[PDB]
Symmetry: D2
Subunit: 196 residues, 4 copies
């Protein structure tokens, strides 16, 4: 009865996957308002008091698998290690967008209806990091560079990057990605059309 | 009055050609009222080019002008092949194009969609030997030599860096890319109507 | 009693074993009074491992003990495979070690110097089948399957990201004589400092 | 008699600083041996807004300078106006540094071929630390120069040449380890010269 679609959107640190997911969510609100849609952040599954948000070792992957299964099974309430609880309606079909670094672990692949990897080069990602944290939020340039390079870079190199080819769709990031946005939104509309 | 151009690029032995042949047959079976045609970038090779992989073997400006004419709604286009195609002006047009260098910067603005079929070089070499050696019974050494001495420098220096000009990169698993791109063409056909 | 440890890593079918033997020749002929020997990381595999490429198949902690013992000047060291290595204590010693997982963060402090033999994936597969199919007349299909299904995930997930831990990355090609000479000169610089 | 050392690398990889310190070490340690550092930027086309792109480089002029040093000519002038006098009574060590030294056409002229490798985010970090934190330039303009000009040039034209090097030296934010490696290599070349 209650059908659910899960979209895993992975990517490296500062690849803009959250903004991309908000844009997809706009299309879902306007084109399928009777379908329940929601964005979930993999960071809500960080272990409590984790120091390194980039490292795979900081993520409760089993809790995430349990949440994925509960969504597929038609559950109405899911609670996350965050402390957050999410009401999932049972009088609508559901499409859950999920966003994070480690969505494409082999162990996780069978749970997704669709799999996307937001690909951006390391320098462009560092540029986004600097423009957000230094230019906009007036943080300290050296500390921001060091957080990126000493913490985010080893995590990306060892654990995130090798999962990128597990995606069905790799989205290369640019100044304007409107065409790729409509490819993906049309794909999600096709998913809901078959689901409904 | 409307024409849709779909560029599907990819490395040597990435299967992009068969991908477009299958999409072409699906257009023939499911949308005969729409004009569909597949153009191969090899139609723009220079005469008697020994190296089909190398960028230097391709008349890129001739390809840019054929693309521009298709974008402007031209009714007849002629190729360096010597062949000429009539594109009807009383039908919507959906043009599949396949080749190594479709995603050079100067060509990017003409496409309705830009797709790169991605595989790792060892995967592509495996495909190359399974076709050329196991099926065609070619000499393993000569096939490996063609791949590594001719196709690999071309891909490494001239094809690979264009992959990020695509709107969509399809990592190939050996069916997935075919389903995605056919659904994409259904959406494009509906929007063009 | 001084010891220099050279860690030589690389992917599957990168030719690092052959390169290490070439380095060994130059050590034998150039510094015969220094003890030199090549050790393979494959002697630290767990018994009856089905996947020789996977990191999970390697007793890395035993490898760390052996590195520590070599540095401490030990004379006899036995490996998980059953081998025992006699290292003279009346000579200085240079130990070349060869394998997939040598340049892993935890292991970096033990090496006197660190090399990664780099080769692209397609040329490594070419080496693989030219050895195993053209020379050894194995089955082309099974060889391709072994490379792509077992060697390739191990390399992509665990070997490749360690390559930039090397002091020297050696790009593989038909003629590596210039790079071979560079590395041999480096190793004799190490020996000259040791004496 | 003659040694040509090509040290290539991407934008903001520190190959210039490394080569400068190698040249100064050569001045102190082998003063009887003629040492000179040639910058590929001396072969930029006039009024180049993009110093990174291959198309802004007079490569043919660079190959002719390479051949003239190989043949032992006594002066070669560079497109920027500097001229090099090569003594006929001295051994010579020519350090060369630049993005495109490892184009295939140019490979045979070198005694040694080195690529200073660093990841693109590390090189952007070097660029920003040097030109924003140290030289007090505008962060947005520096980032735009790196990403819109240096990055396409590196990705399409510098990167693919990197495996033409004999030796790739991986580096992080500083250049000390590469400096020691190449310093010892130059000492071995000098010993061979005597």
């Amino acid at each position: 009865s209650v059908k659910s679609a899960i979209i895993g959107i992975a990517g490296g640190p500062f690849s803009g996957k959250t903004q991309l997911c908000e844009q997809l969510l706009e299309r879902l609100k306007s084109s399928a308002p009777s379908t329940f849609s929601k964005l979930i952040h993999l960071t809500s599954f960080l272990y409590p008091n984790s120091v390194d948000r980039y490292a795979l070792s900081s993520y409760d992957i089993e809790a995430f698998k349990k949440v994925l299964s509960l969504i597929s099974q038609g559950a109405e309430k899911i609670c996350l290690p965050d402390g957050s609880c999410i009401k999932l309606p049972v009088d609508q079909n559901r499409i859950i967008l999920i966003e994070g670094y480690y969505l494409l672990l082999p162990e996780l692949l069978p749970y997704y209806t669709s799999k996307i990897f937001v690909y951006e080069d390391a320098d462009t990602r560092l540029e986004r990091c600097v423009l957000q944290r230094v230019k906009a939020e007036k943080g300290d340039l050296t500390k921001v560079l060091n957080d990126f390079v000493t913490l985010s870079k080893p995590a990306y190199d060892s654990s995130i990057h090798p999962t990128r080819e597990n995606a069905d769709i790799i989205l290369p990031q640019k100044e304007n990605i409107d065409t790729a946005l409509l490819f993906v939104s049309q794909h999600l509309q096709d998913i809901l059309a078959e689901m409904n």
